[PDB]
């Protein structure tokens, strides 16, 4: 079968804060971006859909900055909250590398996805 892992710890003294307001709170934990159904092999030109979803997504409103590589660039709020799927078009085929960076108050998760776009050859 398949599966995925994750790990990372990050904790310093009280040196230094950027918050005039103490809230009891939790960093983000599982995060990761998932395609719309399992695909093997999409057409160029065809819009993909980003599916994006928390295990606990305890923390508060955190930032989200998904990289599609191809140039397009997009900074998202709260993307799990809005739980709105991120469309994409492609022109050129070929397998791309798309990342998402996560960064609240509390903690900071990331994640890295995938795709891959053959052009209209059989399959």
């Not at 819009?47 to 191809?70: A, H, I, P, W």
């Not at 509390?106 to 053959?118: C, K, M, P, T, W």
């Amino acid at each position: 079968g398949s599966s995925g892992s994750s790990g990372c710890e990050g904790g310093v003294d009280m040196q230094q804060s950027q918050v005039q307001l103490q809230c009891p709170l939790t960093p983000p934990r599982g995060l990761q971006v998932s395609i719309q159904g399992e695909a093997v092999a999409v057409r160029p030109g065809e819009d993909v859909l980003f599916v994006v979803r928390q295990e606990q997504g305890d923390v508060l409103t955190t930032k989200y900055q998904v990289d599609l590589g191809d140039g397009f660039k997009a900074m998202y709020v709260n993307l799990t909250l809005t739980g709105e799927p991120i469309r994409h078009r492609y022109e050129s085929p070929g397998i791309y590398r798309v990342s998402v960076r996560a960064e609240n108050t509390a903690g900071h998760d990331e994640a890295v996805l995938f795709v891959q776009v053959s052009g209209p050859s059989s399959g």
